[PDB]
Each structure stands twice: as C-alpha cells, then as structure tokens.
Amino acid sequence: TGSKPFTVPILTVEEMTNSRFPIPLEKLFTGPSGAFVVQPQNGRCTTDGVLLGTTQLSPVNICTFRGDVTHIAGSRNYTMNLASLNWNNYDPTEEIPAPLGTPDFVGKIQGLLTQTTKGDGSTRGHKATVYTGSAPFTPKLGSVQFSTDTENDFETHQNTKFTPVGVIQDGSTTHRNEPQQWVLPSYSGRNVHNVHLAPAVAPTFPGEQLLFFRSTMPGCSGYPNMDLDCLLPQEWVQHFYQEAAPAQSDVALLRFVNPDTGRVLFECKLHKSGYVTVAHTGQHDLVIPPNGYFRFDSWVNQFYTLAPM
C-alpha cells in the first residue's frame, strides 16, 4: 500500500541508447545463454533505482577514460593515470569494481586520445586503442595503456581524454573471435579477482530466455564481432534512478504494445534486479514496429508463466 507507481520510459527501442557503449539501440534479441555467463557491469540498475556494478548515469561517459599520460619509450604506447569525470583524483578504494563507465568486456576498443595543454590551450588528437584483456589494463588500480599513432606528441601532466568509437580484431586470426562481450576484464590485472560486481543473471523459468537490447559497435580494423547486448537501455537506468519506485514484488510484468494497431505483441518479465526475460526457445531477432514500446502492467512474481513470445 502506498508505493510510488512503477513505470518504464515510453521511448521506443530505436529512441534509446546502449548502456554498455555510446551507440543507439537497434533491436531486441533473445537467445539461450547457458554457454556464457551474463554478468555485464554497465547498464546495471535495480527497478527501484540502485545503480550496480560500474554503472553510472551518463550515456556519453561509457568506455571513456580521463587522466594524464606517460610515454613508454621505444613504442607508441602511453600509460594513462586515471582521473575522475570532473578531472579530480581517482580513488581506488571506493567499493566499486573499477571506475564507473569502465569497459565491461574483453576487446580492443579504438577511438581518439585527445589532450589540451593548460598554459596556451594548444590541443592534439591521435587514434588510440585500449586492449581491455591485456596485462596493463588495470583501471581499478588507476592505470590503463593506450596504443597510439604517435611516439612524441602527447605531453606529460596535461589533461587527456579517450573517446571510444568502435572495436578491432586481429585479422590474422579467426574472424569474429573478439571482442568477447560476455568476458569481463580483470579490472586490477592478471589473476586478480574482481570485486563489488553486479551479479550474473540467467532465466530460471522453463522456456524463458533473457531479452537483450542490442546494438552493433562500429568496427575499426579487421574482422570484429560487433554485437553488443545490454540488459537495460541507458534511459531505463536514468529513469529508475530518478523514479526510485519501490519494487512491490520480484517481477514487473511489461507488455510490448503497438500503438499503430492497439495490440500487444508480447509480454516479458522485468526482474526487480534489472533484467528482462521472455518465453522463447532459440536465437531470434525480434521484429518490432518502430513505434512499439514497453508498458508496465502489474507486479507478478518469479512463478508467473508468460504467454509465449
């Protein structure tokens, strides 16, 4: 009695943003997930607005890094000592897995590393790639490495930003073998256990699968696997964070409605810990009308049987 009514945004899928990389959502996808552990750290939020993992609120502070850089002699690599979003000191003892927004998959993320010299406002920018499966990827410790197209242009002790664009793959190896979107980086480096993680999720009900919000990351070199699935759109993270409507049960029943025809396409379970399941067996790209949207209908529980998708 007296709970703030729960709701989800009325934005359509194509009007929303992937919570794991700064690109629009394209489609909904469902498939079996017994062959991987689904434990992304971005795009994690409970329905009552508790951010989990490395999740933060900005759609354009995801897979970014800020700090200052040191050149590694004999190479085009730079070590970035990480700062916070507002350029303050990074605190490695905060009870999070890594700075909020840190990439949550193993892959080679390419973008631009940019810098401004405080004294005169001179600026510079270079193509750069961060290898999140590599030994120098230690964001939790406050340090990551970038491979760039320069050995001398970046200055020390000047604010430097990495803006992600897409992913690459080693073209001499099996096509689409990376990125591995369901493999978490080791945030503190090789053989150091991750901490404070958002939990892995899986369907529990017979005949159910996770429902993913899917985008295609830009590819920047080689033959990458560009598929990227998030559990919640970034706008849903922002919505629940603000609304903070109490979860009246374990499961919010949503209906996906077509306002063009006035008919419900399918129903799904939004679990209070922040993920969606549907009743379907097999890999399936959902086909949805551009104006279709999710609408909260009622609180049910994990024993509720969904109508087949």
Ligand X SMILES: CC(=O)N[C@@H]1[C@@H](O[C@@H]2O[C@H](CO)[C@H](O)[C@H](O)[C@H]2O[C@@H]2O[C@@H](C)[C@@H](O)[C@@H](O)[C@@H]2O)[C@H](O[C@@H]2O[C@@H](C)[C@@H](O)[C@@H](O)[C@@H]2O)[C@@H](CO)O[C@H]1O
Q: Which residues are near ligand X by CB under 6 A?
A: 122-124, 153, 170-172, 221-222
Q: Which amino acid is at 251?
A: V
How are beta strands 143-148 and 77-82 bridged, if at all?
antiparallel
Shorter beta-carbon distance to its own copies: residue 28 or 306: 28
The option from ligand X, its own copies, none interacting with 251 (CB < 5 to 8 A, set by class) reads none
For 304, which DSSP code?
Answer: P
The option from its own copies, ligand X, none interacting with 172 (CB < 5 to 8 A, set by class) reads ligand X
- Measured between alpha carbons, how far is residue 19 from residues 107, 150, 212, 265, 286 in Å? 17, 31, 11, 24, 19
Shorter beta-carbon distance to ligand X: residue 27 or 76: 76
The option from its own copies, ligand X, none interacting with 205 (CB < 5 to 8 A, set by class) reads none
- Shortest gap between Cβ of 11 and its own copies (angstroms)? 6
CB contact set of 102 (below 8 Å; sequence gap of 6+): 41, 42, 54, 63, 139, 140, 185, 187
Shorter beta-carbon distance to its own copies: residue 171 or 308: 171
CA–CA distance, 20 with 197 (Å, rounded to integer): 15
CA–CA distance, 79 with 85 (Å, rounded to integer): 18
CA–CA distance, 70 with 148 (Å, rounded to integer): 12
The option from its own copies, ligand X, none interacting with 170 (CB < 5 to 8 A, set by class) reads ligand X
Shorter beta-carbon distance to ligand X: residue 121 or 206: 121
The SS3 of residue 14 is helix
Sites of contact with its own copies (CB under 8 A): 9-11, 14-17, 22-24, 26, 56-61, 85-86, 110-112, 114-116, 120-125, 127, 161, 163, 165-166, 168-169, 171, 175-176, 218-224, 226, 235, 238, 241-242
Shorter beta-carbon distance to its own copies: residue 70 or 116: 116
- Shortest gap between Cβ of 160 and ligand X (angstroms)? 12
Is-cis flag, bond preceding 179, omega within 30? Answer: yes
Shorter beta-carbon distance to ligand X: residue 61 or 221: 221
- Shortest gap between Cβ of 37 and its own copies (angstroms)? 25
CA–CA distance, 120 with 128 (Å, rounded to integer): 24
- Shortest gap between Cβ of 131 and its own copies (angstroms)? 16
Tokens of 51: 């951010």
